[PDB]
C-alpha cells in the first residue's frame, strides 16, 4: 500500500532526474572524477573558454541555464505520477508553473554544501566565497539559497525522502486558478500520508521531521516570493512543457 506508493514515486524520480542526491554526495566526497574548482575569475574563464585553450551577468546566466533541464525533468517526473496525468490540462499547467520554482530550489540543496555548489552536471564546483565576491545585488540573491540549503541538508533527507517531497511540492491544492481543487487536495493528501509513513520508517528516531518538512515547504514558498522580488529590482518540446 503506502510502502509501495513511496517506492513507485521513488522510481519515477530515479528515472527522471540525473543528479540524484546520492550521486551528488558521491562526487562532493569524491568516490570513483574530481570536479574542476572555480574560485576566481581565471578559473571561471577557463570553465567557459577551455581548461587548456560583466561577471555578475555570467554567473546568473549560468544559474538560468540549469533550470531548462531541471524543469524538463520535473515535467516528466510529474507526468510520470499517474494521478497527475489524469488531471485536466489547465490544472497540470497551473501546478507546474507555481510548483517548479520551489522544487528547483528544493533540489538545489542536493548539490550544495557549506563551501560551494556543484556545476556542469557534476564536473565543476563553484565555491561559496567566490559567489559571495560578486557585486550586489547579485550576491544578495544567491546567498539566501545557500542558507536554506545548509539548513535543509542538516535534516539528513535522502533521495527516497526527496522523491515524495518533490511530489508534494507540485501536487499542491493552494495554487491560484486551479479548476479541480478537491481532486488535487486528495492526491496530495495521499502523497502526504505516504511521506509521513516513509519518514517514520526511514528516520525512526527523527520524530518531528515531517512537521519540520512541512515548514520547509512554507519556507520555500517565501524564498520564491523574495526571489521574484529581487529579480525585479535587478533587470530594471511537447505542448505543456513549452508552456511552463
Ligand atoms: O535567473 C534567476 O532566476 C536568478 O538566478 C538563479 C536561477 C536558478 C537558481 S536554482 C539553481 C539550480 C541549480 C541546479 C541544479 C541541479 N539540480 C537539478 C537536478 O537535481 C539536482 C539539483 N544550479 C544553479 C546554479 C548555478 C551556477 C552558479 C554559478 C555558476 C558559475 F560558476 F559562475 F558559472 C554556474 C552555475 C542554480 C538559482 C539562481 C540564483 C540562486 C540559485
Decide whether any atom of ligand 1 lies within 6 Å of the 184 Cβ. no
Decide whether any atom of ligand 1 lies within 6 Å of the 112 Cβ. no
Q: Which residues contact 184 (CB under 8 A, 6 or more apart)?
A: 87, 91, 95, 171, 172, 173, 175, 178
Decide whether any atom of ligand 1 lies within 6 Å of the 19 Cβ. yes
Decide whether any atom of ligand 1 lies within 6 Å of the 142 Cβ. yes
* Atom 15 of ligand 1: nearest residue by CA position: 108
Method: X-ray
Decide whether any atom of ligand 1 lies within 6 Å of the 157 Cβ. no
Phi, psi of 130 (to 5 degrees): -65, -45
Q: What is the resolution in angstroms?
A: 2.7
Domain-wise residue ranges, the chain: 1-244
- Residue carrying the nine cell digits 550586489: 136
* 1-244 to CATH, choices 3.40.50.10420, 1.10.275.10, 1.20.1250.20, 1.10.565.10: 1.10.565.10
Q: Which segments of the chain does DSSP mark as H helices, in order?
A: 2-14, 21-28, 41-49, 56-79, 82-85, 89-108, 128-132, 139-154, 159-170, 181-202, 209-232
> For residue 59, how far is its CA from the centre of ligand 1 (angstroms)?
9
Amino acid at each position: 500500500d503506502l510502502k509501495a506508493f513511496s517506492k513507485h514515486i521513488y522510481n519515477a524520480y530515479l528515472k527522471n532526474f540525473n543528479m540524484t542526491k546520492k550521486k551528488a554526495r558521491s562526487i562532493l566526497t569524491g568516490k570513483a572524477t574530481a570536479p574542476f574548482v572555480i574560485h576566481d575569475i581565471e578559473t571561471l574563464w577557463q570553465a567557459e573558454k577551455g581548461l587548456v585553450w560583466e561577471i555578475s551577468v555570467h554567473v546568473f546566466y549560468r544559474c538560468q541555464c540549469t533550470t531548462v533541464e531541471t524543469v524538463r525533468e520535473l515535467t516528466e517526473f510529474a507526468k510520470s505520477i499517474p494521478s497527475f496525468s489524469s488531471l485536466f490540462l489547465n490544472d497540470q499547467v497551473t501546478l507546474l508553473k507555481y510548483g517548479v520554482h520551489e522544487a528547483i530550489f528544493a533540489m538545489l540543496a542536493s548539490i550544495v554544501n557549506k563551501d560551494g555548489l556543484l556545476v556542469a552536471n557534476g564536473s565543476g564546483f563553484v565555491t561559496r566565497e567566490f559567489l559571495r565576491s560578486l557585486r550586489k545585488p547579485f550576491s544578495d540573491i544567491i546567498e539566501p539559497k545557500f542558507e536554506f540549503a545548509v539548513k535543509f541538508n542538516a535534516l539528513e533527507l535522502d533521495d527516497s525522502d526527496l522523491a515524495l517531497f518533490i511530489a508534494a511540492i507540485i501536487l499542491c491544492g493552494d495554487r491560484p486558478g486551479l479548476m479541480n481543487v478537491p481532486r488535487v487536495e486528495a492526491i496530495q493528501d495521499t502523497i502526504l500520508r505516504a511521506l509521513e509513513f516513509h519518514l517514520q520508517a526511514n528516520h525512526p528516531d527523527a520524530q518531528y521531521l515531517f512537521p519540520k518538512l512541512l515548514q520547509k515547504m512554507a519556507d520555500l514558498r517565501q524564498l520564491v516570493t523574495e526571489h521574484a522580488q529581487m529579480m525585479q529590482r535587478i533587470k530594471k518540446p511537447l505542448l505543456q512543457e513549452i508552456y511552463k
